[PDB]
Amino acid sequence: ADSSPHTAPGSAGRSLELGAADIQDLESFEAGRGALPARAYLQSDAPRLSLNGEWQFRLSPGSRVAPDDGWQLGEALNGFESLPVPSSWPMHGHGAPAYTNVQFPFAVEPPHVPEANPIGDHLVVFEAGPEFFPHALLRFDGIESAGTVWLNGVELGTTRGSRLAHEFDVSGILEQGENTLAVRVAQFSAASYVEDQDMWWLPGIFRDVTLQARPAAGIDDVFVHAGYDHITGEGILKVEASRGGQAIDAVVRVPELALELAAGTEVRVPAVEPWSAEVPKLYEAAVSAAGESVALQIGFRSIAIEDAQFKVNGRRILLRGVNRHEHHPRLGRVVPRDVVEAELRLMKQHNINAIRTSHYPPHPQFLALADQLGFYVVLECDLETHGFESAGWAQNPSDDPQWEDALVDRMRRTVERDKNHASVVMWSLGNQAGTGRNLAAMSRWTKDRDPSRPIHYEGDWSSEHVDVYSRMYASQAETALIGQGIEPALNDAALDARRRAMPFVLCEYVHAMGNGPGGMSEYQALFEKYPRLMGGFVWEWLEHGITVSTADGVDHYGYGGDFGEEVHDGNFVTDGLVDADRRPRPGLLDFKKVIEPLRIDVARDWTGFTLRNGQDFADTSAFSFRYEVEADGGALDGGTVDVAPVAPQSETVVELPGSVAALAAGLSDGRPAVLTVRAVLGADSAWADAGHEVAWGQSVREPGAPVPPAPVEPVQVQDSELTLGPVVFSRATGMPTSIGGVPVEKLGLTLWWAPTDNDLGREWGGADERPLATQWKDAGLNRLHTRLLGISANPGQDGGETLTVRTRVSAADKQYGVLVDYTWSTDGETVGLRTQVRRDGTWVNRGFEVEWARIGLEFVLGEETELVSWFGQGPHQSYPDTGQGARAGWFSLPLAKMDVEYVRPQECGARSGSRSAALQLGGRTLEICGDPFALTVRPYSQDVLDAAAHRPDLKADGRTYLYVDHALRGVGTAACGPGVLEQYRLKPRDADFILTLKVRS
């Protein structure tokens, strides 16, 4: 209290504030107290009782008013109500979720906690039979953030490390019969300063609570060591077992390998089948002492770094990864097992082979599923101090000696829990925790304890205390330099030499927020080309949307700020490949294609395809290779082709049946036809059914360019309207008012789109750091207006005429514009529309050149569209730097399914590469043909889309908004990481393009 300003004469007086002792504990730097030693999560035959279920719960707003009313004895519970456990309690109407990204939601003065600090008191009465005596423990697999535990009124201890397990000995405290377990949980504690992950703040007892008997002569911990010698094919096996901190005699049995060996001895198993994400071979094993048996699944694999490559079982691997948080839209950090199983299958179904547990250990039962389904796992300790960065990392716990014991404890618990799982191929120290002596201490502890797994940590770019060089969101350009080993040197020659000898991983890349991510293919090409590049993990698997309801009961996802937060980061928590209910976003469909493990390159003459097996261990024997030829009328040919199995990293040429090329050779010129070759699962796997598609390639015979009609109809002039065949025009605006009877409310040029999440991010570098969306607003691109310059008819053919409508498009207060001429022609059935765009003045504003979203047309039609059909790419959306998963073909969707249900509505739903489109408007069909154009159809305007913050803000107005774009820009990943690559940016230019239109009934 010396820094506090007042100085009082006399000796110090007594402290009168309430709650001083509770707050002193919450502000403790200690890693909790009273717990048993950290150990593995082990399946054992020891009796077990889950205490999950309906508990009693009372919430107080802070420690100083949290009652000390003997509630732990369970006799006075008038202020308590039912609450399920496990739970994140703000998901059940107690307080509210709060989202921050980097910023802490409390003043940064470690270790101190704010006065507003929700305290949740939990209580359950349970029965314990004789099998839990004399010895038993209570296990808590997660408490956010600070728990104090009592049993029958006796304090057992405290928990720190919110996603880490704690166990408490209850021998001599547990009683036969009824027992009362009480747990006081503080939302905030000193630990909050090291738990600043970009996710919802959610207090609770959010994982299992278990009573476990500890029979005499049992097994407390087990450490499986299961290596693979790829030269000899041998497994290298040693299973350590301990009780009470001492090595014990136990018997290890592995029936499938005909093994019975002693614990603690290393043996060579003459032939094992090694474990990989591709082939996750597991051997069932048991480790047995007199009083207890532990069941294990052993996968034999060895991890090595050599020649600047990350190798498993002697081979460089490619990580096709995602960052997986634990989130459920209605349960918070509680993820039901069926949801976990389904989402891991969904990952495999989209070609993912690797998971980073961003940024804390997962539920303990996740590891066995990863072992079984096959993922390379980066298992990350629960540590993130990101919010200290804004003060230059002043007071960062990672470098503060007072935090050493707490941070080493986090790493020890992380490592000990999950050390037996073959899927764990790297330990990660944490995320965005800066640099410091405590991270070094965590690394040293881990390397000493478990030298079998390399250490990962992105926060220290010098990589002094790690085994791989990790970065997040490094540009494609920088990744290419690193891939070639030619990045700039570190200042320290010794550190530079070490880091240049390290393989390189992107622990986060291609930020998948909203419409995006763009630029994935450019990273993937590098990963495949350069051995030092290990691959990357997309940020992130899921959107953390939280289900809410409007006043009328319309369900939608909420994000930061939807829960009254004073400080929050908005929709940055909805930044995934799937929504919170695990529905794919288009980015997942594109990603699947980008990382597909086979490359199928179909010959232009349709005689065959080149096949490259991009897997590391498996051949192609799991796949059936299918071909199909489709034309406008439907499939013309199809079947299967036998492919002799191609070894990993090998390539072959496969001949297709002669009927396919004969078909190609017979096609009329200009008739469209698509040959697709697909690799599907030949048989059910653990993660998908036979017929599931893994890879594909195509060859397309493109339709001929559209033929404008002969301009043989003349312009008929009336007082207020002009008629040209099936088109009627306003003489006041020059715009069509109907085409073939389809009412047209507006036709005009487009240059802008409703900003994506990426367009709301700053594009660092250069002198202009305004987000693109702000550049557009400042430039008036969202508020264009059109002036009519003139309308005239010109001589056509055989008495016909064309009609040229001259316009200029600009914005209020701007001098730059584009002259736009529309030239219309018709033979009475088809309409030709030529659009010519010429800049009039430099598109520069506030000293920076204005980029465009598009060069296109918006037709506003005075009727609703029922069905949208097109030839192009699909079925899902595609933009210049996305759409890898959109394949060539003929597609048809009801209008509602053209949209994409991003949580914050934004530009989406364009189908790039379209050659023809057909919109069904009641009883008429409007057909559009062009050289490649992008197609979008919506039931609301761009201004409605831009203004909407949530999906219920969208409303259909009875019209159809049809967008036909001659040019589009890419979407990039500027919300976090690279913006649109140069080749996909759209700079102002002069342009012309032709469309043909037809209305049939």
732 touches its own copies (CB under 8 A): yes
Q: Which does 886 bind (CB under 5 to 8 A by kind): Na ion, its own copies, none?
A: Na ion
CA–CA separation, 352 and 109 (whole Å):
41
639: closest CA among 622, 659, 621? 659
Query: 272 or 318, CB closer to Na ion?
Result: 318
Is 587 a binding residue for Na ion by CB under 5 A? The answer is: no
Q: How far apart are the first and last CA of the chain?
A: 86
| Calpha distance 680→620 (Å, rounded) | 10
3-state secondary structure 359-422: CCCCCCCHHHHHHHHCCEEEEECCCECHHHHHHCCCCCHHHCHHHHHHHHHHHHHHHHHHCCCC
Q: Which does 341 bind (CB under 5 to 8 A by kind): its own copies, Na ion, none?
A: none
CA atoms within 13 A on the CB side of 658: 0
Phi, psi of 612 (to 5 degrees): -115, 130
Range in contact with its own copies (rule: CB under 8 A) among 57-65, 341-349, 488-496, 973-981: 57-65
Binding-residue pattern over the window 789 to 828 for its own copies, x denoting contact by CB under 8 A: xxxxxxx-----xx-x-x-x-xxxxxx-x-xxx-x-----
Site for its own copies in 556-595 (CB under 8 A): 566-567
Instruction: Identify which of residues 167 and 863 has a Cβ nearer to Na ion in the complex.
Output: 167
Angle formed by the axes of helices 476-483 and 520-529, to 10°?
0
Q: Which stretch binds its own copies (CB under 8 A): 240-248, 391-399, 405-413, 428-436?
A: 391-399
Name residues contacting its own copies, limited to 63-92 (CB under 8 A).
64-65
Q: Which residues pair with 148 in a beta bridge?
A: 158, 184
Among 142, 387, 714, 970, binds its own copies (CB under 8 A): 387
Q: Which of 395, 610, 774, 920 binds its own copies (CB under 8 A)?
A: 395
Using the rule CB under 5 A, which residue among 51, 886, 910, 980 binds Na ion?
A: 886
When CB distances are held under 5 to 8 angstroms depending on the partner's kind, the choice from Na ion, its own copies, none that residue 883 binds is: Na ion
Structure token digits, residue 376? 């390379």
- Strand bridging mode 727-730 / 721-724: antiparallel
Instruction: Specify the residue, 405 or 821, whose C-beta has the smaller distance to its own copies.
Output: 821
Shortest distance, position 841 Cβ to its own copies, whole Å: 8
Residue 516 interacts with Na ion (CB under 5 A): yes or no: no
Return the residues of window 189-208 that contact Na ion according to CB under 5 A: 198
Residue 339 touches Na ion, criterion: CB under 5 A: no
Residues in region 1-30 near its own copies by CB under 8 A: 1, 3-6, 8-10, 12-20
Looking at residue 584, what DSSP letter applies? Answer: B
In the list 47, 84, 114, 889, the residue contacting its own copies (rule: CB under 8 A) is: 114
In terms of CB distance, is 563 or 890 closer to its own copies? 563
Q: Which of 720, 767, 798, 923 binds its own copies (CB under 8 A)?
A: 720
Q: Which 11-50 residues touch Na ion, going by CB under 5 A?
A: 35
List the single partner that 35 binds among Na ion, its own copies, none, CB under 5 to 8 Å by kind. Answer: Na ion
Site for Na ion in 130-149 (CB under 5 A): none
Q: Which two tokens stand for residue 540?
A: 């992130």
Does residue 905 bind Na ion (CB under 5 A)? yes
Binder of residue 912, out of Na ion, its own copies, none (CB less than 5 to 8 A by kind): none
Q: Which stretch binds Na ion (CB under 5 A): 125-133, 186-194, 290-298, 880-888?
A: 880-888
Binding mask 902-921 for its own copies (x = CB under 8 A): --------------------
Taking alpha carbons only, the member of 141, 165, 290 closest to residue 219 is: 290
Query: Which parts of 160-278 are beta strand (E)?
Result: 166-169, 177-186, 199-201, 204-205, 209-213, 221-229, 234-243, 246-247, 251-254, 259-262, 267-269
At residue 655, the 3 state secondary structure works out as strand
> 956 in helix, strand or coil?
coil
User: C-beta of 708: minimal distance to Na ion in Å?
Assistant: 28
The length of the chain in residues reads 1001
Contact 286, 330 (CB under 8 A): no
Residues that bind its own copies (rule: CB under 8 A) add up to a total of 84
Cβ(208)–Cβ(139) under 8 Å? Answer: yes
The Cα–Cα gap between 347 and 598 comes to 17
572's contact among its own copies, Na ion, none, with CB below 5 to 8 A by partner kind, is Na ion
Spacing of C-alpha 110 from chain mean position:
32
Q: How far apart are CA 430 and CA 427, in angstroms?
A: 9
Q: Which range of residues in 146-154, 342-350, 521-529, 781-789 is near its own copies by CB under 8 A?
A: 781-789
* Residue 533, binding choice from its own copies, Na ion, none, Cβ under 5 to 8 Å by partner class: Na ion
- Give the binding site for Na ion (CB under 5 A): 35, 198, 527, 533, 572, 575, 642, 873, 883, 886, 905, 946, 948
